[PDB]
Amino acid sequence: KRCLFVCRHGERMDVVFGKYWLSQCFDAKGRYIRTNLNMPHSLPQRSGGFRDYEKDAPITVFGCMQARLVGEALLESNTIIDHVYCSPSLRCVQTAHNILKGLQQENHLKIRVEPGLFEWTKWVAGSTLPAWIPPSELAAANLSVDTTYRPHIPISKLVVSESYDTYISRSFQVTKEIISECKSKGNNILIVAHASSLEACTCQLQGLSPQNSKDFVQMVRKIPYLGFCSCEELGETGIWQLTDPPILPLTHGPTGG
Amino acid sequence: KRCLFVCRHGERMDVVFGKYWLSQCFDAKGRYIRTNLNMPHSLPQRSGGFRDYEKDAPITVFGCMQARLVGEALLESNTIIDHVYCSPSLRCVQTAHNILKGLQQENHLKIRVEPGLFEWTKWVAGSTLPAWIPPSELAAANLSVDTTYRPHIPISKLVVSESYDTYISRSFQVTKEIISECKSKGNNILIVAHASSLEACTCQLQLSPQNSKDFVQMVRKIPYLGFCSCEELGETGIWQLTDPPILPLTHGPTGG
Ligand SMILES: O=C(N[C@@H](Cc1cc(=O)[nH]c2ccccc12)C(=O)O)c1ccc(Cl)cc1
């Protein structure tokens, strides 16, 4: 077969509890005090204190469970994952790790943190990139990250508020580089990143021309949490095609009220 | 203090997947075939076939997690639940069970199924009540129900398309009958019912029950596993609302 799977990260803390979520779970002294059961028991310590979460928020408890279930669904369908890459966004690393937990592969597979899979940098606030936890420190928080992996696009080569074309171009360049270095090692590749990744990583893989920016944004906003798409290589053509994913979709509603 | 905990059931299968949800997860021959990871691995075989679900829908996978977490939160607060009662709706009994799982008390405790705790019957479709699974059949699905339990208001004594006055009374009466029999047994009692139940059961145990229009508004504002706490003001017999012993639970949808 040989497949490439691209899925979106889990439910975001800064979506459910809004842009001022740190207000609701950190006190004056900076102690994490959860005020909701959807908040995790504890948050990992960061190199810049809790304010590094403002532009790089973690997934919720239900975000972990979405990720666990997709992993459990891959195992149940005997869908073997040989390689896993993720965006350097904390929400993506956490999703990837929780998929490995559901996959029962926490202690075998080591996640390849690729900054080239970070979403369109136009969607970052201010004139500074997020303070992404380095692989070495993600590993030191139990998250099953490969600290050996050489990134195709380092953090230093990412542009602040890049053009649509810059984002689409690097998304394509990095996906071919990912595919190229996994030609030898294994069949199936899982990418855990953003809504934008599912289209930007696959669009030009099929030989097709990319969408215009406004069509792209509309496609991207219809992709749910842990939204999962699939690409099979057509023979040895080098072109890949989208296919019915190996697992069922995942749809739940809100808490309500 | 001596507490009464009233909480709504978990996420409904028939809300997420619509009114035609049996169309999506049952084929010609009545074989359950899930089409989404939020649908459970399997559904219990029902007395009168699969069509009995049409009016008594089960909670989703994420429905069970909502319940589990509420249960786990009760455990962590050092809150010992001494007696647990619930509506005869499958969603309510499934919620009740997953709270006991969350409490690590599936074996120790047994759920008291009370038809008197069922929601306002005006919200029933057709001219017939839902074909509820009897406490005997529920315990045969590994759901930790108390087959012993003598219901204060049995099914046969429930009126189809009842009035707002009849509901608040039967909700008030059953709550007192629940408080009465527990007096000695333990301290804290847990009701597991519907969005209506949280108001109807603790309104006049504290006040004049609100009008029908004001009620419906308050009900639709209560989330899945929404949780309120009442405590007896001494031995006076007048109970009052209090900041619950556990945090609330808020999550968004799948989206798109
Ligand atoms: O929903 C957010 N992000 C999106 C990407 C995204 C980001 C953006 O700025 N504008 C957009 C417009 C159209 C489409 C997508 C975007 C994602 O998760 O895929 C999001 C971002 C910040 C916070 Cl505090 C909370 C939530």
Side-chain angles (χ1 to χ4, degrees), chain A residues 2-18 21-22 24-40 42-46 48-50 52-54 56-109 111-121 123-126 128-141 143-149 151-160 162-172 174-182 186-233 235 238 240-243 245-257, chain B residues 3-18 21-22 24-44 46 48-50 52-54 56-77 79 81-82 84 86-100 102-106 109 112-121 123-126 128-141 143-149 151-156 158-160 162-164 166-172 174-175 179-182 186 188-189 191-203 205 208-209 211-212 214-216 219 222-232 234 237 239 241-242 244-256:
Chain A
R2 181 163 200 212
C3 306
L4 172 68
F5 309 120
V6 185
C7 74
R8 179 168 186 230
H9 58 70
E11 170 173 83
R12 294 175 59 158
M13 284 274 290
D14 60 354
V15 161
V16 180
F17 304 110
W21 62 280
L22 293 172
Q24 305 180 37
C25 69
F26 280 100
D27 66 7
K29 296 212 175 64
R31 295 176 289 191
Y32 177 71
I33 307 165
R34 65 197 297 254
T35 57
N36 191 291
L37 296 191
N38 195 21
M39 276 170 206
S42 64
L43 278 185
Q45 207 180 340
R46 301 194 73 150
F50 78 79
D52 277 354
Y53 283 112
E54 219 167 66
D56 188 36
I59 64 178
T60 68
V61 172
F62 271 68
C64 293
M65 230 278 286
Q66 287 159 5
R68 246 100 55 76
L69 273 184
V70 164
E72 284 183 20
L74 286 163
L75 182 62
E76 280 198 55
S77 62
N78 314 322
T79 308
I80 305 289
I81 305 296
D82 297 293
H83 307 116
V84 45
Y85 299 71
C86 80
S87 157
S89 282
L90 177 56
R91 61 184 169 280
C92 303
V93 175
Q94 279 175 343
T95 304
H97 180 65
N98 277 259
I99 293 168
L100 288 180
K101 270 156 59 62
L103 212 51
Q104 276 176 51
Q105 293 285 323
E106 316 95 289
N107 316 316
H108 175 225
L109 294 172
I111 296 158
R112 288 164 197 171
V113 181
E114 181 50 53
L117 289 173
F118 184 62
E119 69 184 351
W120 189 10
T121 62
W123 291 336
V124 186
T128 194
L129 283 171
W132 297 312
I133 298 162
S136 69
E137 272 161 47
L138 290 169
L143 301 167
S144 300
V145 154
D146 179 351
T147 71
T148 266
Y149 171 70
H152 306 296
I153 302 189
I155 297 159
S156 73
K157 286 301 191 168
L158 283 173
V159 181
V160 191
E162 73 199 322
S163 73
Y164 173 67
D165 301 329
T166 301
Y167 173 60
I168 293 292
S169 178
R170 75 167 167 78
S171 283
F172 181 49
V174 100
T175 302
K176 273 189 295 188
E177 290 186 288
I178 282 168
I179 286 162
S180 179
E181 73 180 348
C182 295
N187 259 35
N188 290 344
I189 313 172
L190 175 52
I191 289 173
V192 182
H194 311 257
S196 61
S197 313
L198 275 91
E199 223 286 314
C201 292
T202 69
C203 56
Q204 300 196 252
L205 219 66
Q206 311 151 110
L208 306 179
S209 299
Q211 305 286 336
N212 67 52
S213 69
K214 263 146 223 299
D215 288 321
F216 179 80
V217 170
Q218 280 184 334
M219 295 190 100
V220 159
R221 286 195 60 200
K222 300 197 293 209
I223 285 156
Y225 293 128
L226 267 300
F228 199 104
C229 80
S230 187
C231 265
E232 296 190 23
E233 184 170 35
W240 301 58
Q241 63 140 16
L242 294 160
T243 58
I247 55 156
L248 302 176
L250 171 52
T251 316
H252 67 64
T255 220
Chain B
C3 284
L4 180 74
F5 304 132
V6 190
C7 75
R8 187 190 177 185
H9 57 73
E11 178 178 81
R12 297 170 71 168
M13 274 280 293
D14 59 356
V15 170
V16 175
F17 295 107
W21 70 275
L22 287 169
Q24 280 173 239
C25 69
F26 283 98
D27 74 348
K29 315 210 167 209
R31 299 177 292 190
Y32 180 66
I33 306 167
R34 74 211 282 260
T35 44
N36 194 294
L37 298 186
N38 193 25
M39 301 183 180
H41 162 75
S42 68
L43 294 174
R46 280 197 87 114
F50 85 76
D52 286 354
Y53 279 116
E54 204 167 308
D56 191 26
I59 58 166
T60 57
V61 169
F62 278 75
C64 299
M65 185 199 185
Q66 290 164 351
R68 261 193 49 259
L69 283 189
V70 158
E72 286 175 0
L74 283 165
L75 196 157
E76 286 177 334
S77 63
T79 306
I81 307 307
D82 296 303
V84 51
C86 71
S87 150
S89 291
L90 183 46
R91 58 185 181 274
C92 285
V93 176
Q94 283 178 335
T95 311
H97 185 48
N98 278 282
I99 294 181
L100 298 185
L103 259 182
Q104 289 252 59
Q105 305 258 27
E106 317 100 288
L109 306 195
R112 295 167 163 168
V113 177
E114 177 58 43
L117 277 169
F118 184 62
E119 61 177 9
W120 182 19
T121 62
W123 292 320
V124 176
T128 181
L129 283 175
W132 293 311
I133 309 177
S136 187
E137 278 183 42
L138 284 169
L143 295 158
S144 300
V145 183
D146 189 36
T147 38
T148 289
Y149 183 69
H152 292 301
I153 298 162
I155 295 172
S156 53
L158 277 169
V159 185
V160 158
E162 81 201 327
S163 61
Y164 175 47
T166 312
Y167 173 57
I168 295 294
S169 167
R170 83 164 166 94
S171 296
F172 180 107
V174 68
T175 306
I179 278 164
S180 184
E181 69 179 344
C182 276
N188 306 331
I189 308 93
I191 291 169
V192 179
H194 310 244
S196 57
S197 315
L198 273 84
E199 178 80 68
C201 293
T202 62
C203 60
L205 181 60
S208 48
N211 68 68
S212 70
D214 288 8
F215 180 65
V216 157
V219 165
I222 291 182
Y224 297 129
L225 271 297
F227 200 100
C228 67
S229 174
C230 274
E231 318 203 339
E232 197 170 357
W239 302 58
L241 300 190
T242 185
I246 54 141
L247 298 171
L249 191 146
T250 319
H251 66 70
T254 238

